[PDB]
Write a protein that binds this ligand. Structure first.
Ligand SMILES: Nc1ncnc2c1ncn2[C@@H]1O[C@H](COP(=O)(O)OP(=O)(O)NP(=O)(O)O)[C@@H](O)[C@H]1O
Ligand SMILES: [Mg+2]
Ligand SMILES: [Zn+2]
Lengths: 35, 112, 703
C-alpha cells in the first residue's frame, strides 16, 4: 500500500465556530503567563 | 456582448437602474454551432462558415468540425450503434468517472 | 484600594466578572498600560502616534488592532468577544484618560472617546449568523443597501415634570425601549412627561441595512440581510452601494410585530456597530503612518521613479509600455481648477484602449479596478444610460420620487471602467458626455431638477470594426465612434497583435513565466510592490496639488497649431482646447507622480510626448514615417542633452587644469544650475563623460 499512500501524499501536497479555537490558543498563553 | 466578459474574465458586470453587480461566471463553455447554409463548406474557411465574430472566436480554446459524410459504411455503423444500444438497454461506469474526475481536479500541476 | 489580580480565573460569568469593581479596575489599568507601552516591530510607540494623529484632526475616535491587542494583553482579547459592551466601555474610559494625559486640554474638544476594534479574526458570513453569536462581537461583510439620515437620538434625557418646573434626573437611553421616569420624586405626579430639549444630551444615530454582496454567494438565490446601528462618530462612515466590512455586537430584543408575523416568540436582531471598514478602500490617507509618508517621500527622490511607477502598473503584462504610461498618468490624474471662480475645467484624464483581440485591454481594466480605490467596472450591454448616470425611483417606503446615484456618481472621485466600449448602445454611450467633460450629471425628471457631481476618470476598452485593427486605415476610419465622444478621451491608445517572432518569443516566455510564477503552490527597472504603489497613489492624490506657473507657452501653442494642421489632412481629431488641456492635465499628472508641487519642463515634455505618440499611432501605416519625422524633428522629442554638459565639463576642466598648472563636481553643477540644463543625472548615466575619462562620487565630489 506504499504507492497508494504516496498518491495520498501527493494529494495532500496539493490540498493546501472559531471563537473556541481563539479562546483555547489564547488560554495556552495565559497558562504560560501563570507558570 | 456579455459573453465577451463571461468567457475570459469569468464575470458579468451589470450596471443598471437599482442594481450594480459584478456576478461570478467561473464556467467552462461547451458550444455547439450551425454553419451558414446548414452544410459545412470545406472550400470555405471556418471563419467564412460561421457568423461568430473574431473576438468571440478568440475566446475558444478548441474548435472542432463535424461534417456529415455520405459514406455507406459510416451510415450503417451509425444505424447499428443506435439500434443495438437501444436494444441493449434493459470500460468504466459513470459513477467511477465522476469520482475520478472530482479526485483528479484537486491536483494543480506545475510547469517543468 | 482595590488590589490587582490574575484575571482569567473566576466563578462568575464573563459579563458579571468584568462588571465587578476589582477586575474592572484591573482591566482598566491593563488597557491603559497596553496603550502607553505597545510598540511596532521596529520599536515605534504605536498609540502615541495614533493619539497625536487623532488629536490633531479632532477625530475623537481611537482605532485599535485586535491582532496586537491579543499579542500584548491576552485576557483582554479573551474577554472582548465574550463581553464586548462592558469591555469596550472600560476601554473607552482608559483611552480617554490616556488621551487627557498626552493632551491635557483635549477635554475642551471632546468629553468622550470611542475605542474602535479592527481586524477582528472571528469573521462570519452574513447568512451564517445564528443564536450562538448573540451578544458577542462579530465581523461581517456586505453591501449597504439602505441608510436612514443622520438623526439625533436621546442618550441622557432629563424630563420636565408634567405639572411643575422640576427636572427629573438623567435616564440612560437604550436601543430596546424608550426609558421613562414613572413618577416625579419632588411630587409624585405620573404618566406623561416633557423632555427638557436643552439639557437633554443627544447622540448621532444612523440605521443601515446591509446584505450579502451580489457576487459572493447569491448565485440566483435571494441575499440575506441584517440591520446595523451606527452611533456617534460612526455615522456617515458608509453610503448605499458601499462594500463595507462591519464589526459590531450581534444584539437581539423582543419585537411584537415579528411575533405576530411568525406566530412564535421570535426576537428581532440588529448589529450595534463598533467599526466600519471598506473592502475597496483598503488604504486611506487618514490611515497612513509617518513611516509610510517617509518611505513614499524617499521613493520620490529616485530619478527612476517615473519608470518605476510605469513598470509597476499591471506587472504581469508584458510590453504595452505606452499603455502603462497613459494609465499611470490617468491613475494619478491632473489638478482641477476654476480660474476666476466662474469657469470650471476638469483635472481628470480619460483613456481609451482600442485594438484587436487577445491584447490584455480588459485585463488592464481589471488591474485598474483592483489597484484604485472607489473604482467600478461595467461592460457593454450590461451598462445602461440610466444606470451609468443616475436613476429616479419610487422610494421603497415613502413611495415619493427620489434620485439615486449611477455609476459615474458612485465613482465621483474614482475611476469608471467601461469594457468593450464599442459594443454599447448609442443611447447608453452618449449618456456620459456631460460626466466626461463638465463632470456633472444633470437630471430633470419627475419633479427632481438638480445636478450631481461626477468628477470621474473614464478608462474604456474597445475593438475596432470587424474586431481586427487594420493599419491601412486611420483610427477614425475604423473605430466607429464619433468625434464628440472620441475628443473627450484625453489619451487614445492603439494595440495591435502584429507578428514579430523575436517579440513573440519574449512575450510568450514572459506569459509562461507568469503562469509558473503565479502557481497556487520591456521593464528593465523592477516595479514597486503593489501595496507600496497603492499607498503612493493615495498619498499623491491628496497631499500633493501641482501648480502651474510656466510651461513654454509658445512651444505648446506652435505644437498644437501644426498638430491641428496635420490632423486636418488625416483621421484623428484634436478638437481645439481639449487636447491643450489634456497636455496640461498630463503635465500635472507627471508632476503628481514625482510628488512635485510645481510643474516643470520635464513634465511638459512628457505630456507633449504622450500626445504626439498617440496621434502618430492613429495615422495610416504609410503616413507614420512622414508624420513622425515632422513632429520628432521640430516638436520636442527631447531625448537627452548630453553634449552641452560634456563641453561645459571639458571647459571647466580645461580652465581648472590651466589654473593648476600655471571641488570640480560643484563647479560642474554650478554652471548647470545657471544654464537651463538642470537635470544633470542623465549626463552621469551617459557614456559621453565616461569615454572622456570623467567619473563621479557623491562623497568625494571630484570628477
Ligand atoms: N502582453 C501580454 N502579457 C500578458 N498576458 C497577455 C498579454 N496580451 C494578452 N494577454 C492575455 O490575454 C488574455 C486576454 O486578455 P483580455 O484583456 O481579455 O484581452 P482583450 O484585449 O480584452 N481582447 P478582447 O476582449 O477580445 O478585446 C489574458 O489572459 C491576458 O493576460
Ligand atoms: Mg476585452
Ligand atoms: Zn410636579
Amino acid at each position: 500500500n506504499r504507492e497508494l499512500e504516496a498518491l495520498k501524499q501527493r494529494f495532500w501536497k496539493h490540498a493546501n465556530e472559531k471563537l473556541q479555537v481563539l479562546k483555547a490558543k489564547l488560554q495556552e498563553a495565559m497558562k504560560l503567563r501563570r507558570f | 456582448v456579455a459573453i465577451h466578459e463571461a468567457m475570459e474574465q469569468q464575470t458579468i458586470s451589470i450596471t443598471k437602474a437599482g442594481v450594480k453587480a459584478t456576478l461570478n461566471a467561473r464556467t467552462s463553455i461547451l458550444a455547439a454551432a450551425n454553419p451558414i447554409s446548414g452544410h459545412y463548406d470545406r472550400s470555405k474557411s471556418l471563419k467564412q462558415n460561421i457568423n461568430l465574430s473574431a473576438p468571440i472566436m478568440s475566446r475558444f480554446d478548441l474548435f472542432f468540425i463535424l461534417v456529415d459524410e455520405c459514406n455507406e459504411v459510416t451510415d450503417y455503423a451509425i444505424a447499428r450503434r443506435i439500434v443495438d444500444l437501444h436494444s441493449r438497454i434493459e470500460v468504466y461506469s459513470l459513477d467511477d468517472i465522476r469520482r475520478y474526475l472530482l479526485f483528479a481536479r484537486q491536483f494543480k500541476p506545475k510547469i517543468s | 484600594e482595590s488590589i490587582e489580580n490574575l484575571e482569567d480565573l473566576k466563578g462568575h460569568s464573563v459579563r458579571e466578572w468584568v462588571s465587578m469593581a476589582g477586575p474592572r479596575l484591573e482591566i482598566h489599568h491593563r488597557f491603559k498600560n497596553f496603550l502607553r507601552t505597545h510598540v511596532d516591530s521596529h520599536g515605534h510607540n504605536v498609540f502615541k502616534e495614533r493619539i497625536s494623529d487623532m488629536c490633531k484632526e479632532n477625530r475623537e475616535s481611537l482605532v485599535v488592532n485586535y491582532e496586537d491587542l491579543a499579542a500584548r494583553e491576552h485576557v483582554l482579547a479573551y474577554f472582548l468577544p465574550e463581553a464586548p459592551a462592558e469591555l469596550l466601555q472600560i476601554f473607552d474610559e482608559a483611552a480617554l484618560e490616556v488621551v487627557l494625559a498626552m493632551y491635557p486640554k483635549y477635554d475642551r474638544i471632546t468629553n468622550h472617546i470611542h475605542v474602535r476594534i479592527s481586524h477582528l479574526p472571528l469573521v462570519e458570513e452574513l447568512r451564517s449568523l445564528r443564536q450562538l453569536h448573540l451578544n458577542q462581537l462579530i465581523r461581517t461583510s456586505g453591501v449597504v443597501t439602505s441608510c436612514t439620515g443622520v438623526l439625533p437620538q436621546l442618550s441622557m434625557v432629563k424630563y420636565n415634570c408634567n405639572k411643575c418646573n422640576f427636572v427629573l434626573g438623567p435616564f440612560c437611553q437604550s436601543q430596546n425601549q424608550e426609558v421613562k421616569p414613572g413618577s416625579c420624586p419632588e411630587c409624585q405626579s405620573a404618566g406623561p412627561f416633557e423632555v427638557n430639549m436643552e439639557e437633554t444630551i443627544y447622540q448621532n444615530y444612523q440605521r443601515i441595512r446591509i446584505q450579502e454582496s451580489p457576487g459572493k454567494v447569491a448565485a440566483g438565490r435571494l441575499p440575506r440581510s441584517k440591520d446595523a446601528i451606527l452611533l456617534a462618530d460612526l455615522v456617515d462612515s458608509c453610503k448605499p452601494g458601499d462594500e463595507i466590512e462591519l464589526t459590531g455586537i450581534y444584539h437581539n430584543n423582543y419585537d411584537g410585530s415579528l411575533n405576530t408575523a411568525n406566530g412564535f416568540p421570535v426576537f428581532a436582531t440588529v448589529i450595534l456597530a463598533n467599526h466600519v471598514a471598506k473592502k475597496d478602500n483598503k488604504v486611506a490617507v487618514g490611515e497612513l503612518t509617518d513611516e509610510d509618508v517617509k518611505m513614499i517621500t524617499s521613493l520620490s527622490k529616485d530619478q527612476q521613479i517615473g519608470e518605476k511607477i510605469f513598470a509597476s502598473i499591471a506587472p504581469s503584462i508584458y510590453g504595452h509600455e505606452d499603455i502603462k504610461r497613459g494609465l499611470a498618468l490617468a491613475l494619478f490624474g491632473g489638478e482641477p481648477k476654476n480660474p476666476g471662480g466662474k469657469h470650471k475645467v476638469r483635472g481628470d484624464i480619460n483613456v481609451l484602449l482600442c485594438g484587436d483581440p487577445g491584447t490584455a485591454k480588459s485585463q488592464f481594466l481589471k488591474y485598474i479596478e483592483k489597484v484604485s480605490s472607489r473604482a467600478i467596472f461595467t461592460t457593454g450591454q450590461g451598462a445602461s444610460a440610466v444606470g451609468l448616470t443616475a436613476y429616479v425611483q419610487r422610494h421603497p417606503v415613502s413611495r415619493e420620487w427620489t434620485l439615486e446615484a449611477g455609476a459615474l456618481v458612485l465613482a465621483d472621485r474614482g475611476v469608471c471602467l467601461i469594457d468593450e466600449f464599442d459594443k454599447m448602445n448609442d443611447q447608453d454611450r452618449t449618456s456620459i458626455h456631460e460626466a466626461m467633460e463638465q463632470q456633472s450629471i444633470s437630471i430633470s425628471k419627475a419633479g427632481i431638477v438638480t445636478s450631481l457631481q461626477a468628477r470621474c476618470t473614464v478608462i474604456a476598452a474597445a475593438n475596432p470594426i470587424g474586431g481586427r485593427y487594420d493599419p491601412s486605415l486611420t483610427f477614425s476610419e475604423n473605430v466607429d465612434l464619433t468625434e464628440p465622444i472620441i475628443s473627450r478621451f484625453d489619451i487614445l491608445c492603439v494595440v495591435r497583435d502584429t507578428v514579430d517572432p523575436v517579440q513573440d518569443e519574449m512575450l510568450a516566455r514572459f506569459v509562461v513565466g507568469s503562469h509558473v510564477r503565479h502557481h497556487p503552490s520591456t521593464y528593465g527597472v523592477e516595479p514597486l510592490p503593489q501595496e507600496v504603489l497603492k499607498k503612493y497613489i493615495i498619498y499623491a492624490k491628496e497631499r500633493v496639488h501641482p501648480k502651474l506657473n510656466q510651461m513654454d507657452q509658445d512651444k505648446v501653442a506652435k505644437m498644437y497649431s501644426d498638430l491641428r494642421k496635420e490632423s486636418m489632412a488625416t483621421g484623428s481629431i484634436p478638437i481645439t482646447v481639449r487636447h491643450i488641456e489634456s497636455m496640461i492635465r498630463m503635465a500635472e499628472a507627471h508632476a503628481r507622480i514625482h510628488l512635485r508641487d510645481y510643474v516643470i519642463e520635464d513634465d511638459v515634455n512628457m505630456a507633449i510626448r504622450v500626445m504626439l505618440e498617440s496621434f502618430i499611432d492613429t495615422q495610416k501605416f504609410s503616413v507614420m514615417r512622414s508624420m513622425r519625422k515632422t513632429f520628432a524633428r521640430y516638436l520636442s522629442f527631447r531625448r537627452d542633452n548630453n553634449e552641452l554638459l560634456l563641453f561645459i565639463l571639458k571647459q571647466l576642466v580645461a580652465e581648472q587644469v590651466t589654473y593648476q598648472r600655471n571641488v570640480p563636481e560643484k563647479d560642474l553643477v554650478d554652471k548647470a544650475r545657471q544654464i537651463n540644463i538642470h537635470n544633470l543625472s542623465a549626463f552621469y548615466d551617459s557614456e559621453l563623460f565616461r569615454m572622456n575619462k570623467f567619473s563621479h562620487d557623491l562623497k568625494r565630489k571630484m570628477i
